[PDB]
Amino acid sequence: ASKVKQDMPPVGGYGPIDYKRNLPRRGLSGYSMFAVGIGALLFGYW
Amino acid sequence: TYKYVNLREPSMDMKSVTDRAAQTLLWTELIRGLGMTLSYLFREPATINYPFEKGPLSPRFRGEHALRRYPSGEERCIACKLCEAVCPAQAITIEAEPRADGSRRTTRYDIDMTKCIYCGFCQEACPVDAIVEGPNFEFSTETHEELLYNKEKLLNNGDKWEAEIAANIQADYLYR
Amino acid sequence: MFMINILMLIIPILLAVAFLTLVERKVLGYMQLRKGPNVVGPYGLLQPIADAIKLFIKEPLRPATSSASMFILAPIMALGLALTMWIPLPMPYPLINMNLGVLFMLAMSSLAVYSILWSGWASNSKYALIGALRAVAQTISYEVTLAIILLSVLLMSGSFTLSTLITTQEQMWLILPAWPLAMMWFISTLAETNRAPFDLTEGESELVSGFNVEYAAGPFALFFMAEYANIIMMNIFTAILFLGTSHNPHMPELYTINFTIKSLLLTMSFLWIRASYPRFRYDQLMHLLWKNFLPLTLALCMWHVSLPILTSGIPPQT
Amino acid sequence: SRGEYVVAKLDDLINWARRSSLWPMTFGLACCAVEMMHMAAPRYDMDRFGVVFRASPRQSDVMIVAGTLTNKMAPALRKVYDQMPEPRYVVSMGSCANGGGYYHYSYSVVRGCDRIVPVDIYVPGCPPTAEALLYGILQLQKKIKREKRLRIWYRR
Amino acid sequence: MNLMLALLTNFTLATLLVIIAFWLPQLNVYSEKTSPSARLPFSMKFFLVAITFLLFDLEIALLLPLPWASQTANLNTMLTMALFLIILLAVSLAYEWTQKGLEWTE
Numbered sequence: 001a002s003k004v005k006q007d008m009p010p011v012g013g014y015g016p017i018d019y020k021r022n023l024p025r026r027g028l029s030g031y032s033m034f035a036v037g038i039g040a041l042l043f044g045y046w
Numbered sequence: 047t048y049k050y051v052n053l054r055e056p057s058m059d060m061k062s063v064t065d066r067a068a069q070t071l072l073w074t075e076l077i078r079g080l081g082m083t084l085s086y087l088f089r090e091p092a093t094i095n096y097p098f099e100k101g102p103l104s105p106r107f108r109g110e111h112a113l114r115r116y117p118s119g120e121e122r123c124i125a126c127k128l129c130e131a132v133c134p135a136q137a138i139t140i141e142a143e144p145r146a147d148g149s150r151r152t153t154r155y156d157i158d159m160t161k162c163i164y165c166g167f168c169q170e171a172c173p174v175d176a177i178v179e180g181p182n183f184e185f186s187t188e189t190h191e192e193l194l195y196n197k198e199k200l201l202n203n204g205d206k207w208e209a210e211i212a213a214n215i216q217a218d219y220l221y222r
Numbered sequence: 223m224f225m226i227n228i229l230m231l232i233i234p235i236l237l238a239v240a241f242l243t244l245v246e247r248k249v250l251g252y253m254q255l256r257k258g259p260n261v262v263g264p265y266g267l268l269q270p271i272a273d274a275i276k277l278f279i280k281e282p283l284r285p286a287t288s289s290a291s292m293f294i295l296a297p298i299m300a301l302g303l304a305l306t307m308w309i310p311l312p313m314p315y316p317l318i319n320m321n322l323g324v325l326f327m328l329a330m331s332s333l334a335v336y337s338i339l340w341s342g343w344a345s346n347s348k349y350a351l352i353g354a355l356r357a358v359a360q361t362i363s364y365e366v367t368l369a370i371i372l373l374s375v376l377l378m379s380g381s382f383t384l385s386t387l388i389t390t391q392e393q394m395w396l397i398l399p400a401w402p403l404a405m406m407w408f409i410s411t412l413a414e415t416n417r418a419p420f421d422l423t424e425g426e427s428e429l430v431s432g433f434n435v436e437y438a439a440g441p442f443a444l445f446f447m448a449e450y451a452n453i454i455m456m457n458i459f460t461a462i463l464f465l466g467t468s469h470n471p472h473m474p475e476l477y478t479i480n481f482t483i484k485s486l487l488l489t490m491s492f493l494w495i496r497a498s499y500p501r502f503r504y505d506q507l508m509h510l511l512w513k514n515f516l517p518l519t520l521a522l523c524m525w526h527v528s529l530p531i532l533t534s535g536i537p538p539q540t
Numbered sequence: 541s542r543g544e545y546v547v548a549k550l551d552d553l554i555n556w557a558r559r560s561s562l563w564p565m566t567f568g569l570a571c572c573a574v575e576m577m578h579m580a581a582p583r584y585d586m587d588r589f590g591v592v593f594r595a596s597p598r599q600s601d602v603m604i605v606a607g608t609l610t611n612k613m614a615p616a617l618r619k620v621y622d623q624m625p626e627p628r629y630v631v632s633m634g635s636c637a638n639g640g641g642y643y644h645y646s647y648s649v650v651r652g653c654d655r656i657v658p659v660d661i662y663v664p665g666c667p668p669t670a671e672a673l674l675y676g677i678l679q680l681q682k683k684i685k686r687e688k689r690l691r692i693w694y695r696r
Numbered sequence: 697m698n699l700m701l702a703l704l705t706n707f708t709l710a711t712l713l714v715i716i717a718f719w720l721p722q723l724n725v726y727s728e729k730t731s732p733s734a735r736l737p738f739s740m741k742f743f744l745v746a747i748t749f750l751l752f753d754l755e756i757a758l759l760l761p762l763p764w765a766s767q768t769a770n771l772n773t774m775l776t777m778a779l780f781l782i783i784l785l786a787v788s789l790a791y792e793w794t795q796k797g798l799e800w801t802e
C-alpha cells in the first residue's frame with residue numbers, strides 16, 4: 001500500500017523564526033558627538 | 047496576554063538628556079534613515095524583465111477558459127449544465143439538443159468573459175473535465191465584443207492550449 | 223565670442239536638467255528595489271527625449287486663464303531668472319565677473335517668487351490662488367535664513383565676490399568652521415526649491431491637491447525645467463560656498479572636474495532625501511523656520527561677526 | 541524626398557515619444573486597484589517602461605479604470621475624462637469595468653465603463669494579474685505605434 | 697555690455713520657448729471641446745507671515761554691509777552696533793513668539 005503523503009512540517013519541526021523588534025544601537029554618546037563637533041569648529045576657526 | 051507598545055518613561059539624567067539633545071541638534075535618527083535607503087541603492091532590484099521573463103505561477107492558476115476533448119477528439123462536454131447552474135456571475139449560457147448521431151451535445155456554449163469572476167467554480171462542477179480555466183492570462187483585447195466567447199472560440203482555446211492544460215491537470219488532479 | 227560663451231552655458235544647462243529627470247527616476251528606483259527607466263534607450267538614456275517631445279505636442283489644458291498676460295509672464299519669468307542665476311558662477315571663471323555676485327544671486331532668487339504669485343493669479347481659481355500664497359509664504363520665510371546664513375559665511379570670506387570664496391577655502395573647506403551653518407543652509411535650499419520633505423505644492427494638504435480639481439496652468443514642461451535648473455544651481459552654489467575646490471590657474475579643467483563631482487553628489491543628495499522621509503505639515507515647516515532655524519541663525523550670525531574680531535582673523539576686503 | 545516619406549518618419553517619431561512616455565491616471569475604484577499597485581511595485585516596475593506611477597490628471601495621457609463603476613460615480617469619471625488633455629486613451633481593467641462583472645445585474649452598477657467613456661484596451665480578469673495589466677499596457681503601446689495621424693493628414 | 701547681452705539672451709530664449717510651447721500643440725489641430733475683488737476668505741495669519749518677512753527683511757538690509765564694516769579702525773563701535781542690530785532682530789522674534797504671532801491654530 002502507498003502511504004499517505006501530504007504537505008507536513010519536517011520531522012522535528014522548523015527552525016526558530018525571529019519576530020521581536022531589533023533596532024541595534026549605533027553611534028557615539030551625546031558627549032562624544034558634541035565633543036567631535038566642537039573640535040571640528042575649533043580646528044576650522046584656527 | 048498583552049504588551050504595551052508605547053509606555054516607556056525617558057530617563058532624566060545628564061547622560062540621557064544630552065543624548066536626546068544630540069539627536070535633536072545633530073539629526074542622528076534622520077541620518078539613520080538615510081543609511082537604510084543608501085543600503086537599498088546597492089541591493090539588486092527585484093524587477094523581472096517582462097515580457098522576456100515571467101512571474102512564477104502554479105498548475106492551479108485560473109486563467110482563460112477552454113473546452114476540452116477526449117483523446118479520440120470527441121468533445122468532453124455533454125451539456126449537463128452544472129457549470130451554468132453554479133456560475134456565481136451567470137456568465138455561462140448553454141443550449142443543447144441531440145446531435146445527428148444521437149449524442150448529447152451543446153449547440154450554444156457562451157461565456158461572457160466580462161461577467162466572469164474567474165472563480166473556477168465551473169471547472170470544479172464539471173463532471174467530465176470539459177470546461178477548464180487554462181494558464182493563459184495574456185488575452186486582453188481592443189473591443190468589448192471580443193471578450194464574449196462562443197463555443198467556437200472556447201473549442202479553439204482547448205485545441206490551442208491542450209498541451210499545457212493536460213500537463214497542469216496531470217499535476218493537480220490528485221489534490222482534487 | 224561672448225555670444226558663444228552664453229550658448230555654451232544655456233544649452234548644457236537645459237541638457238543637464240533633462241537628464242537629471244532620468245537620474246532622479248533611476249536613483250529613486252534603486253532605493254525602492256526597482257530599476258526605473260531602462261527600456262527607452264539603453265539604460266533609459268532616451269527617456270528624457272521621449273518625455274520632452276511628448277509634452278510639447280500635448281494638447282494645452284483647460285480651463286482658460288484669468289489673465290492672459292500673467293499666464294504668459296509667469297513661465298518666462300521662472301525660466302529667464304533660472305538661467306540668469308548661472309551667469310556669475312565661477313567654474314572656476316564666471317561668465318560675468320561681478321564684484322557683488324553673491325548679492326546678485328540673492329536678489330535674483332528673491333524675484334523667483336513672482337512666478338508663483340502670477341501663476342496663482344492667472345489660474346482663475348480661488349483655491350489655486352490660495353495654494354500659490356502658501357507656497358509664497360514658505361519661499362519668503364526660508365529666504366530669511368539663506369540671506370542671514372550667507373552673510374555669516376561672507377564674514378570669513380571678506381567680500382561679496384563669488385570667486386573670492388575660492389580663495390577663502392584654499393587651505394580648507396568652509397564646512398569645517400561652519401558646519402552648523404551648512405546644515406541649515408542645505409535644508410533651506412530644499413525648502414526654498416519646494417523639494418521633499420518641503421514639497422507641499424505637490425502634497426496632500428492643499429485646497430487644490432484633489433485630483434478632480436482643475437484650474438488654468440502650464441506649460442508644465444517650462445515650469446518643470448525652471449525648477450530643476452534651480453535645484454542644480456543651488457547645489458552648485460552650495461559646493462562653492464562650503465566645499466571650495468582648489469583652482470590651479472594653469473589647469474582650470476581640474477577645478478571644473480572636481481567642482482562638477484561635488485555638485486553632482488550634492489544634487490544626488492536631494493534625490494536621496496526625497497526617497498527617505500515623509501512630508502512636513504505646512505505649520506510644521508513654518509515652525510521649523512521661525513522657531514528653530516531663525517533663532518539659531520541669528521545667534522550664529524552674532525558669533526561669526528565676533529569671531530574674526532576676537533581671533534584677529536578678519537579677512538581682507540579686496 | 542517625397543512628402544509621404546517625411547510624413548511617415550515624423551509619424552514614427554511622435555508615435556515613439558507618445559508610447560515611450562505614457563503617464564497614467566489610475567482611477568482606483570476597487571480591488572483591481574491593488575493589482576495596479578502591484579504593477580508599480582518592484583517586481584514589474586511600470587516606471588521602467590516610461591509609465592510614471594502617480595501622475596496628475598492634468599498631465600495624464602491614459603486613464604486606467606480599475607474597479608467597479610457605480611451609478612453614483614459615473615458622472616465624476618466622465619468629468620475626469622473630459623478634462624484629460626489629448627491624445628487620451630482609456631484602459632478598462634477587470635471584469636467590473638469591462639462589463640459589470642460580478643455586479644452586472646445590480647441596480648447601482650454601470651454595466652461596463654464603455655457606456656460612459658470610449659475604451660481602447662479591455663483587460664480581462666477578476667482581478668487581472670499585475671502581469672496581465674502590464675501586458676495590456678504594452679498592447680496599448682503597440683496600438684499607439686500603429687497610429688497614422690500624419691499620413692492621414694497628408695492625404696486629406 | 698556683456699551683462700545686458702546675457703540678460704537679453706536668457707529672457708529671449710525663455711520667451712521663444714514659451715510661445716512655441718503655446719503654438720506647437722496647434723499643429724495637432726485637436727477637436728473642439730465644448731464642455732467646461734474681495735477676501736478669499738483670507739486668513740490674517742497668512743498676511744502676518746508676509747509682513748513679518750518684510751520687517752525681518754528690512755533689518756537684513758541693515759546687516760548686509762557687515763563684511764565691509766569689519767574693515768574699520770573703530771572695531772569696538774562697529775561690533776557693538778552690529779550685535780545691537782542682530783539682538784533687536786531677536787527681540788522682534790521673541791515678541792512675536794510670546795504673543796502667539798507664530799501660531800497656526802484657530
Ligand SMILES: CCCCCCCCCCCCCCCCCC(=O)OC[C@H](COP(=O)(O)OCCN)OC(=O)CCCCCCCCCCCCCCCCC
Nearest residue numbers: 038041070071073076402404405406408409495514515525
Ligand atoms: C566653541 C563654540 C562655538 C559656537 C558654535 C557652536 C555651535 C554648535 C552647537 C549647535 C549645533 C547646531 C546644529 C545645527 C542644526 C540645527 C538644529 C535644528 O534646528 O534641528 C532641530 C529641528 C527641530 O527639531 P524637532 O525635534 O522637530 O523640534 C525641536 C523644537 N521643539 O529639526 C531639524 O531641523 C531636522 C531637520 C529637518 C529636515 C529633515 C530632512 C533633512 C535631513 C537630512 C539632512 C542630512 C544632513 C544635511 C547636511 C548637508 C551639509 C551640506
Ligand SMILES: CCCCCCCCCCCCCCCCCC(=O)OC[C@H](COP(=O)(O)OCCN)OC(=O)CCCCCCCCCCCCCCCCC
Nearest residue numbers: 026027028029072074075077078080081401405490491494
Ligand atoms: C546619492 C548617494 C550618494 C552616496 C554615495 C555612497 C557614499 C555614501 C556616503 C554617505 C554617508 C552617509 C550614509 C551612512 C549613514 C548611516 C550611518 C548611521 O546610521 O549612523 C547612525 C548614527 C546613530 O544614530 P542614533 O541611533 O540615533 O544614536 C543616537 C545616540 N547615539 O547617527 C550618527 O552618528 C550621525 C553622526 C553624524 C551627524 C552629523 C550631523 C550633520 C552634520 C553636517 C556635516 C556634513 C558634512 C558632510 C557633508 C559632505 C561634505 C564631505
Ligand SMILES: CCCCCCCCCCCCO[C@@H]1O[C@H](CO)[C@@H](O[C@H]2O[C@H](CO)[C@@H](O)[C@H](O)[C@H]2O)[C@H](O)[C@H]1O
Nearest residue numbers: 236237240243273274424443446447592594595596599
Ligand atoms: C531639453 C529638456 C526639455 C525639458 C524636458 C522635461 C522632461 C520632464 C520629464 C519628467 C519625468 C517625470 O518626473 C516625475 O514627474 C511627476 C509629475 O507628473 C512628478 O510628480 C510630482 O509632481 C506632481 C504634481 O506636479 C504630483 O502629482 C506628484 O505626486 C509628485 O510626485 C515627479 O516628482 C517627477 O519625478
Ligand code: SF4
Nearest residue numbers: 133162163165166168
Ligand atoms: S470562472 Fe466562475 S464566474 Fe467564470 S464562468 Fe466559471 S463559474 Fe462562472
Ligand code: SF4
Nearest residue numbers: 123124126127129172
Ligand atoms: S462544461 Fe462540463 S459542467 Fe458545463 S455543461 Fe459541459 S459537461 Fe456539464
Ligand code: SF4
Nearest residue numbers: 571572634635636666
Ligand atoms: S473586476 Fe474583480 S478584482 Fe476588479 S474590482 Fe471587480 S470584483 Fe474587484
